[PDB]
Point group: T
Chain length 135, copies 12
C-alpha cells in the first residue's frame, strides 16, 4: 500500500496557486482512490531528505521524488536513491527542459525507473497511478 | 474529444511483449474511459510524421508524440511541433536517461508541455489522463 | 535560363502572411523579369529533395535551396549538393543567427557559393538576381 | 546462404567509374563464388532502409550496410540495426577518417560486428568473405 | 533615401580585381537606380567605425556593414550596432562558412536584420535592393 | 610480392585462442595463395616499430599495421607512416568503436588507405586480399 | 528601513583580521548612519540560509548575500533568491575572478541586481549604500 | 588625492537617462566630498585607453575602469592594466552576468583589485568610496 | 596522538558487510596499536561536517576524510578543509576512477596531502599508518 | 609471497632525498616484515615495463605500479595491465591532483584495484600492507 | 636589404631593463652587421599596425612582428599579414607557453613562416639572421 | 662550452634535402664559430632520449631539443626536462602551428626557456647563438 512522496528544497513555497498543503491533500485523496497510502514529506534540508530515502530503502517502499534544486547538484541524494529496491519516479512540476541549461541535467534520472516533468502537480498523481498499476 | 498519438520510427517493432496493435487497443480503451477519442498513428517516415503534426496544428488538437530516434536528431520535427497550439506531451517507453548519452538530448522537450519517460507503455495512458483533466 | 528553387520541410506551411503558393508566384515573376525560368519545388521528404538535387547536378543547373530543418542535420543533403557544378545559394527566411544555437550551424553553408538569411522571402529574389548577373 | 547488402542515400550516384549497377554485379558474382546469395538494395529514403533492416532482423540474415550520410546522423537507423541477431558489417567506400571531422563519427559502428572503410568497392567483397568464413 | 555602407579593416585593399574605389562607384550607381543615396565609408580603425555607426543610430538610417575581421572579434562594434533602430544588413564578400572555423562566428549576425555572404561585391547591391523594397 | 604486416604492443599476447605464432602462419599461407610474400613482425617497442616502417618506406612496400595501443597515442608512429608511398592498411582485431571512447580515435586512420576493425584475425587476411587485387 | 545581510558557509571563520562579530558591528553602524536597519545572519546550513531568504521574500526586504561556497554550487539557493522582489546584491570579500576557475561561476549573479567582489569587508558597506540611495 | 576614471567604447552614448557629461559631474562631486580629485576620461579608441592607463601606471594612481566591450576582448588592455601598482577597480553599469554568455568573461577581472557590476552609475561612486577608505 | 576520521553522507549505510559501527571499532583498534587516538564521526549533514573540520583546524589535528558524495560537489567543504594546518588524507572505499565520470573529480584532492581510493575499509587504516609514521 | 613493484620513467632519478636504491631497500624490508617477497624493478623503457607486466600476468602475481609519466599517456601499458588477474595498485609519490591538469587523468586508475597518491614513498609500503592483509 | 620590425601594443613600455629605444638601437646595429636595413616601428593602434603591414605587402618586404596582445585577439591583423609575399617571422619576448592559457593561441602563427618565443630581445636579432641567410 | 642537441623520432629520416649527418656537420661548425662544442644525438627511442636528458641535468648543460612527435605526447620527456637547470630551447624545423591541430600543443614549451619553430634547420643554429650570447 505505501508510497513515499518526497519534496526537496523550496517546494514548501508552492502557491506563495496550489499550496504544498493542498498538494498533500490532493495526493492523499488520489492515493486512497487507487488503493494506496501516500506519505508526503517536504524538507529544505538535504540530510533530512537522505534520512527519508534511507527509511524507504530499509522498508522496500517506492518513492516519488521531486528533489528541487538538488536534482541538478546532489550526488549524495543520488547515492541514497541507488539503494532503493522498489521503484523511484522522479517528478518535476515545471518542464525543466524549457528552462536554463543547467536544469536539463539530473543526477537522479539515470537511476530512476522513470521521470515525469512539466505536467504540473498532476505529475505526482500520474506517478501514483503508475505505481498502482505495477504493484 | 480528439487526441492524436503519433509514434515514430521503429515503434511498429514493439513486441517482435506488447505489440503496436495491442498498444493501439490499450490507448483507445483508456481514451474511451476518459471521455476522449484517441487517433493512433505510426510511421517510420519523417515526412509522414510531419504531415500528421501539420494536421493536428490545423485542427488545434493535442498530440502525444513518441518520435523514436527522431527525438534526438530532427529539427524538422521540432519545427512542425512548434506550430501546435494545443498541448504536446512527449512520451518515451524506455528511460532515455539511463542509456547512451546521445539519448539524453531531445529537440522536442523544450517545446513540449511536458515529458514522460521510462514508465513503459503506461506513459501513453498517463499522458491521456493529463489531457483529460486539463480539457 | 533555368534555376531550381528547392524548399525543404515545413516550408509548405508558410502563411498558415505569404503562402508557399504566393512565394512560387513571386519567384516566377522575378525570374521572368530577370530573363530566367524558375522551377520551384517543395517537399517534407529528404529523399524527394535528394532526387531534385540529383536532377540539378545531372543538368548542371543552379539551385537556390532552403532546406528547412535539414540545413542543420542532414549530411545526406550536403553530399547530394556537393555534386552540383553550377552555383548553390542557401537561403533562409529567418535570421538563423538570432535564434537557438543549433540553428547557427549549417551542413550546407561550407559547400554553398553563398548564403542569404533573415531577409524574408525577398532572399529568394535576391538569390535569383545574383544568378542572373553571374550567368 | 543469404546476405543483405544495403546502400543508403546518394549511393545510386556512384560513377555519375563503377556504377551502382556494376557494384551489384560485382557483389552478386563474388557472393556466388563464396557460396552465398547477395540481395543488394539501395534507397535514398530512411524509411525504406529501415524496412529492409527490419526484414533482415525478422529473417535473422546478416547485413552489409553502407548508410551514406545517415551513418553520421541517424539514431533511427542505429535502433533498427540493434535488432539484428546476425552479423552487421558497416562498409564505407571512402576513408571517412581522412575527411571532415563530422564523418569520423558513426552511430552504427558501436553496434556493428566490424567496420571496413577506405578500401573502395572491394570493401563490400571483403565483407562478404568475412561472412562466408564465419558461417 | 540614405543608406550607410560601412567597410572595416582591410577592405581598402580590395583589388590590390574590383578596387574599393570601384566598389563605391558600383554601390552609388545601384543606389541611384533604386532611388536611394548610398554613403560609403571605409576604415581600418574600430573607433572610426564606431563613430559612423553612432551617427547612423542618431539619424535612424540603415547600415550595410562589412566589418572585416572585427566581425569575429569586436563586442564594442556589436554594442554600437545594437543602438540602430533602422535595418542592419551584414555583408561579407567571401563565404565565411567555407573558411577557417573562427570565421564562422559573428558577433554581429545575431543583432542584424539579415546577413549575405559569399556573393562577392554583388552582396552589397543585393542588400541595397532589400532596403529599397522595404522602405 | 612483398607485404609487411606489423603488430605493435601486446599483440604477442594473443591467445594467452589464436596465438601470434598461429596468426603468422595463417597470414603467410593466405599471402602465398594470393601470390604475395608476407613478412610479419611484432614488437612492444615503438622504436622497433618505427624502424620497420622506415624500412618499408625505403623499399616502397605496403604495410598492414595493427599498432595496438600506440594507434591512439603515437604521433611519432603516424609521422613514420606518412612517409609510406605504398598502401597502408590499419587493422584492429576488436571493434574499437564498441569500447572505451579513447579507442575511437586513431592517429593513423587519417593517413591510412583504409581501415578494417572488428573482424578478428580475418581482418589481416582481408587486408592482404585488398593489396593483391590492387597490385 | 530593513536590509538582510546573509552570510553562508565558513563566513563564521573570518579572522580566525576582522571577525564575523566585528563585521556585524561594522555593518550595523554603517546601516544606522545610512538610515537603515541591518539584520545580519550567518549559517553553515543551506536549509537555514533558505529559510532566511524565504523570510525576506515574504517581507519584500532586500538581501545582501555572501553565500560562500554555495555561490558556485547551489541551485536551491538560486531558486529561493529568484522569489525576492526587492534587490539582491551578491557580495564576495575575495576577488573570485583571481582564483580557481570554479570560483568564476555563480548561480546567483544572473538573478542578482548586482555583484561586488574583491573589495573586502567594505563590499558589504558599499552594498548598503547602494540600497540606501535607491530606496 | 587623484583617481582616474576611464570609460571605454560606447560609454559616450549614455542617455542618448544619465548622460556621460552628467556622469562626470556626479563623479567629480562625490570625489570632492570624499577628499579625492577624479579625472574622468572616455574614448572609443583602444590606443587612447592604453595611453591613459600607461599614464596612471607611471604616476602610481588608482584607476576605476569600465572598458565597455573591450572588457571581454582585449588582452592589450589587460597587459597595460597589469602595470598598475595602485588599485584597479573594474566597474560595469549593467549586470554582465544577466546577459549573453560572452559578457560573463572579463580579461580584466583577474588582475583587478575588485569588480562592481549591475549597480548602475552608482557603481563608480562606490568604487570611489572604496579608494577613499583604503588610502 | 589525535586523528579525526570524518565520514560524510551515506557512510552510515555501510553493511545494510562491514557496518559503520564495525568500521569505528576497526579504526579505534588500529589507532591504538599505532599509538594514536582516533575520533570517528559520521554525518549526512554538510553543516555538521563543516563544524567538525573547523574544530580540527582550531586544534591543529589531522583529518582522514571520506566526504561521500560531497567529495564531488561541495566547494564549502573544500574551503573548510583549506584551513587545516595538519595533514588531510582523502579516503574512498570504492575506486572512484572505475565508476561514473562525475566521480573522477574531487574538490578535495587538490588540497589534500594525499588520497587513497579503492582499497576498501583498509584505506582508513593505511591513512592512520601514514599519519603515525609522519608524526 | 611475491609482489612486483614496477617503477616507470624518471623514477631512477629519485633523490638526485630518498634514492631509488634506498626505496628498494625500504620496500624489501617492509615486505619481509609482512611475510611477502618484493621484486622491485625500474625502467625508462615502455617495452621493458610491458614485459614485466606480462610476466606478472603469466604468474598471477600482484603488481604495485608507479608508471611515472606513462600513467597519463600510455594505452599500451593499460592494455598490458588489463591482463592481470591479481591486484593492481597504482602508486604516485606526489599528489597528482595538486599539479597540472594533465596529471589528474590516469589510463591505469580505472583498471586498478585501488590508487594511492601523495603519501610519498610510504605509499608503496601501504600498498604492500593492503596486499598482505588481502592474501 | 630592407626588413620591417613591427611592435604592437605595450611594447613602448619596455624597461619602464632594455627600453624600446635601446631595442631599436640593438636591432639597427645587428641589421647593419648582417647587411640589412631594419625599419623599426611601434604603435598601440591596430589601425597603425595594419597600415605598416599594408606597406610591407605593397613593397614585398619581410616583416618581424611582435603584435603584443593583438597576437591573441586580432583577426584583422592576421588578414593584413596574409597579404605578405615575403617572410613573416612572429617574435615574442616572453615564453607565451609558460603563461596563461589564452596566450598559447596566436592568430598569426599559422600564417607566419616561423615563430620565436621566450628568447628575450635576442629573438628579434635571431629573426634578422634568419632573413639574412635566406635572402 | 658544451651544448647538447637532442633529436627525437624520425629526425634520422631528414633528406630521405639536408640529411641528419649534414645537420650534425652544420651544427658542429656553427658551434665552433660561436666558441661552443655541440654534442648532437638522435634516437627514435624515448628511453634513450630520457637518458641523454638525465646526463645533461647531471652535468648542468644546456639542451636544444627537437623531440619530434614526442613533443605532443610525452609527459615522461617533459618530466626529465624539468630537471634541467641550464637553458632548454625547443626547436621544430616545420611550423607546427600551420599544421594539424594536435601539433599546436607541446608538453615541452611550458618548461622551455624558449621555442623556435618553422625556421628550418637554421633554427638549431639560432638556438646555439642564443646560448652563446647568454653564457
Ligand atoms: O526547485 C525546483 C527547480 O530547482 C527544479 O529545476 C524544478 C522543480 O523541482 C520543479 O519544477 O518541480 C522546482 C520545484 C518548484 C517548482 C515551482 C515552484 S513555485 C514555488 C516553489 C516551487 C518549487
Ligand atoms: O526508438 C526509440 C529510441 O530511439 C528512443 O531513444 C527511445 C524510444 O523512443 C522509447 O523508448 O520510447 C524508442 C522507441 C522504442 C522502444 C522500445 C522498443 S522495442 C521495439 C521497438 C521499440 C521502440
Ligand atoms: O524550417 C526552418 C528552420 O528549421 C530553419 O532553421 C530556418 C528556416 O529554414 C528559414 O527561416 O528559412 C525555416 C523555414 C520556415 C520559416 C518560416 C516559416 S513560417 C511557416 C513555415 C516556415 C518555415
Ligand atoms: O555518402 C557517403 C558519405 O556521406 C559517407 O561519409 C561516406 C560514404 O558512405 C562512403 O564513402 O561509403 C559515402 C557514399 C558515397 C561515396 C562515394 C560516392 S561517388 C557518388 C556517390 C557516392 C556515395
Ligand atoms: O576581412 C575579411 C575577413 O576577416 C572576414 O572573415 C571576411 C570579409 O569581411 C569578407 O569576405 O567580406 C573579409 C574582407 C575582405 C575580403 C576580400 C578581400 S581582398 C582584399 C581585401 C579583402 C577584404
Ligand atoms: O592493443 C590493442 C588495443 O590497444 C587497441 O585499442 C585495439 C587492438 O589493437 C586490436 O583490437 O587490434 C588491440 C590489440 C589486441 C587485441 C586482442 C588481444 S588478446 C591479447 C592481446 C591482444 C591485443
Ligand atoms: O567561502 C568563500 C568562497 O567559497 C567563495 O568562492 C568566496 C567567498 O564567498 C568570499 O570571498 O566572500 C568566501 C568567503 C570567505 C572569505 C574569506 C574568509 S577568511 C575565513 C573565512 C572566509 C570565508
Ligand atoms: O559597453 C558595454 C558592454 O559591452 C559591457 O558588456 C557592459 C558595459 O561595459 C557596462 O554595462 O558597463 C557596457 C557599457 C554601456 C552600458 C550602458 C549603456 S547605454 C549607452 C551606452 C552604454 C554603454
Ligand atoms: O558516497 C560515496 C560516493 O558518493 C563516492 O563517490 C565514493 C564513496 O565516498 C566511497 O567509495 O568511499 C562512497 C561512500 C560509500 C561507499 C560504499 C557504501 S555501501 C553503503 C554506503 C556506502 C557509502
Ligand atoms: O613521473 C612522475 C610524474 O610524471 C607523475 O605525474 C607522478 C609521479 O609518477 C609520482 O609522483 O609518483 C612522478 C614520479 C616521480 C616523482 C618524484 C620524483 S623526484 C625524481 C624523480 C621523480 C619521479
Ligand atoms: O604584450 C605582450 C603579451 O600580450 C604577449 O602575450 C607577449 C608579448 O607580445 C611578448 O612577450 O613579446 C608581450 C609584449 C611585452 C613583453 C614584455 C614587456 S615589459 C613591458 C612591456 C612589455 C611588452
Ligand atoms: O617529427 C616531427 C613532428 O612530429 C613534429 O610535429 C614537428 C617536427 O618535430 C619538426 O618539424 O621539427 C618533426 C620532425 C621532422 C621534420 C621534418 C622531417 S623530413 C624527415 C623527417 C622529419 C622530421
Amino acid at each position: 500500500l505505501i508510497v513515499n512522496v518526497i519534496n526537496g528544497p523550496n517546494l514548501g513555497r508552492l502557491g506563495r496557486g496550489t499550496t504544498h498543503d493542498e498538494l498533500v491533500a490532493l495526493i492523499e485523496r488520489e492515493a486512497a482512490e487507487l488503493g494506496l497510502k501516500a506519505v508526503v514529506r517536504q524538507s529544505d534540508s538535504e540530510a533530512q531528505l537522505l534520512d527519508w530515502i534511507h527509511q524507504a530503502a530499509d522498508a522496500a517502499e517506492p518513492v516519488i521524488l521531486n528533489a528541487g534544486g538538488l536534482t541538478h547538484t546532489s550526488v549524495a541524494l543520488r547515492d541514497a536513491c541507488a539503494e532503493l529496491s522498489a521503484p523511484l519516479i522522479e517528478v518535476h512540476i515545471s518542464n525543466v527542459h524549457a528552462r536554463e541549461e543547467f536544469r536539463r541535467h539530473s543526477y537522479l534520472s539515470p537511476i530512476a525507473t522513470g521521470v515525469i516533468v512539466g505536467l504540473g502537480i498532476q505529475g505526482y498523481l500520474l506517478a501514483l497511478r503508475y505505481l498502482a498499476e505495477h504493484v
